[PDB]
Design a protein around this ligand. Structure first.
Ligand SMILES: O=C(Nc1ccc(F)cc1)Nc1cccc(O)c1
Ligand SMILES: O=C(Nc1ccc(F)cc1)Nc1cccc(O)c1
Ligand SMILES: [Zn+2]
Ligand SMILES: [Zn+2]
Ligand SMILES: [Zn+2]
Ligand SMILES: [Zn+2]
Lengths: 360, 360
């Protein structure tokens, strides 16, 4: 059976399981079950399933080189799918809540969930809660007797936490740290002294890399009982490097990809986000250019946004981007080589993850 | 050492642990650590710690009748405190997010967290996420080698889920079920056919009783390794009964307790909530009175709210309340007796929980 169709079958299974359990144990009625079904589909489906499918991919790599009964190959692949959906549902949680937090309008060419007329923020915040609660319901049900249950739950838990810490780093990235104070409304930075490479790296490391690259890789190892085929410090490094690159692309796109293609009208300039463009701009701008940036960044006014965009074009940031990209290629290749020593198989799965990121 | 001061010491310990770990492992800076410290204090402290202290109370009951080394008595009490704070932090999560969802103004005589000037909803939603993530960080750290870890995590997880399911039942309680639809903005019910005792019971059972009464009771059993001193079906029943009573008091107070004493301006009438007053009103009203209720319920207009309040007074709902109260006393007493057969000790802890609820 092909991987994607397995993964999709498992979604239907897990959905039926969750909703049947709501009826049998949580006294749900059919209309609220239907609400929850449509919520799950709307918030969890229609992406590429990169994250979830990486768990499957890593597991399939191990299957090709490890002796097992047929029934065992099926159980490991089922487990990789369940694990993958846990990650997809965890992403869904974060997208729901993030869209609410940021006042976002569209996601993937459709309205954000909270903007559906029969949802509202009042419901959507709780829907997002339920999304994440479902990951735990899946794990305890499907992995109950599994030897990896504890390590998988513990991993999941620390990635979830890292992610929430990252969202805090992200939403506070345009304030001056020394002025954070729950009692005082927060001004936007005027000096941009915290728009640095190291600060940027911290945001991206926590907000995206743990759930997008580390969790799918390591879940794949855990469902395969293969976490001793690898040096976990090397897996973390490679996950953090690739994930950083991913976000650097995401930041460039937010500014320069046409809305209809991006699935989104990008607002990072208006939201005064610590983006890779802003940091790299401030890394090479002269005094005049910096002053112009400060007078126009983080403002709704489309004239001001078009000034900041003009500044970025004339700063030849694509040349800085090529250069970053070259360095990441080289470092990713070095880490893959290091991984080849213990597991050529796992190294190849990392190679695939990198090709998919690097090409998209 | 007295229980409350143990419990409070443990808060300071757990706080220091969480924030030190943010600095050592999550690259946090001191100002964001300070934000998070003040968030934790503001959202987790200043209540009565009923829930958290029930874990301690149950554990202390078992200590009085079980042979143990001194060091073991201290470890079980430490564990009961950690467990108790998990519940308190879980409540804190739900209050933060609930206040945002419901557009609430005050909580305990202070502004809701999201309303602090330097917080905002954008941050507060994520703060609430972090609150709940901290419960898992505590559990894995403090209970890592404990035999009850799995059962405690599994229990916690199903209570958290039940709670979120209950919030969905609550916020949708004024819509007609057959009209729920993410695509269609939701009208308030005109018939109030879903304002029934059984529907009310379902809301309250899920939204409050699992985290307020069941979780503290059963956590106390688990940290004491005493879950075989009891018939778990009886613990659930008694928890659901007392919890229902608790909420019935909460609903009456929302209408009739002066704001400054309630720590809150109650808005259940305006929010068209399925409250015990509304259900009991509609259970005894004549046609004229029902028509007057339908013309005035769920409306911001203070004249209309004062009409619904007038209807409730002249319907002599305090007499219905006395009668409910009498029935609950009798049923709670029956369950306590049933519990006395296996554990007089646990029965007494339940007796205390009931006295604290019944008297407040
Ligand atoms: O190492 C880089 N970091 C980076 C990451 C994030 C950020 F915000 C700014 C810069 N850039 C780089 C580019 C070309 C060559 C090179 O040896 C290094
Ligand atoms: O059993 C009751 N349930 C209840 C709970 C919730 C609700 F919404 C409405 C009613 N009430 C009751 C009161 C006096 C005597 C009695 O034998 C029963
Ligand atoms: Zn965001
Ligand atoms: Zn972007
Ligand atoms: Zn609410
Ligand atoms: Zn109330």
């Amino acid at each position: 059976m092909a991987s994607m169709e397995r993964f999709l079958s498992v979604y239907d299974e897990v959905q039926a399981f969750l909703l049947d359990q709501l009826q049998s144990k949580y006294e749900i009625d059919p209309n609220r079950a239907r609400y929850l079904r449509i919520m799950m589909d709307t918030t969890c489906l229609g992406g590429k399933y990169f994250r979830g499918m990486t768990v499957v991919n890593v597991a399939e790599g191990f299957l090709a080189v490890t002796q097992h009964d047929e029934a065992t190959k099926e159980r490991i692949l089922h487990d990789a799918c369940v694990g993958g959906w846990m990650i997809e549902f965890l992403q869904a949680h974060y997208l729901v809540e993030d869209d609410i937090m940021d006042g976002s309008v569209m996601r993937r060419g459709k309205p954000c969930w909270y903007r559906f007329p029969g949802v509202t923020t009042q419901c959507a915040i709780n829907d997002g809660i339920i999304l994440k609660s479902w990951t735990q319901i899946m794990a305890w049900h499907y992995f109950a007797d599994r030897p990896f249950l504890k390590d998988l739950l513990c991993l999941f838990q620390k990635v979830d936490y890292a992610t929430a810490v990252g969202q805090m780093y992200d939403v506070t990235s345009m304030c001056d740290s020394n002025k954070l104070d729950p009692e005082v409304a927060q001004p936007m930075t005027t000096d941009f002294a915290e728009f640095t490479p190291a600060i940027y790296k911290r945001i991206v490391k926590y907000k995206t890399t743990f759930y997008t690259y580390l969790l799918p890789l390591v879940m794949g190892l855990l469902v395969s009982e293969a976490a001793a085929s690898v040096e976990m410090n090397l897996v973390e490094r490679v996950a953090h490097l690739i994930g950083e690159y991913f976000q650097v692309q995401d930041d460039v796109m937010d500014c320069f990809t046409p809305p209809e293609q991006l699935g989104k009208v990008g607002t990072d300039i208006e939201d005064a986000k610590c983006s890779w463009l802003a940091v790299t701009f401030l890394g090479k701008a002269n005094a005049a250019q910096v002053a112009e940036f400060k007078a126009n960044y983080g403002e709704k006014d489309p004239a001001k946004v078009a000034v900041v965009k003009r500044l970025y074009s004339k700063a030849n940031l694509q040349a800085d981007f090529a250069a970053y990209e070259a360095e990441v290629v080289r470092e990713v290749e070095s880490l893959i080589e290091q991984l080849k020593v213990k597991s050529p198989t796992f190294a190849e799965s990392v190679a695939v993850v990198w090709e998919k990121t690097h090409k998209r």
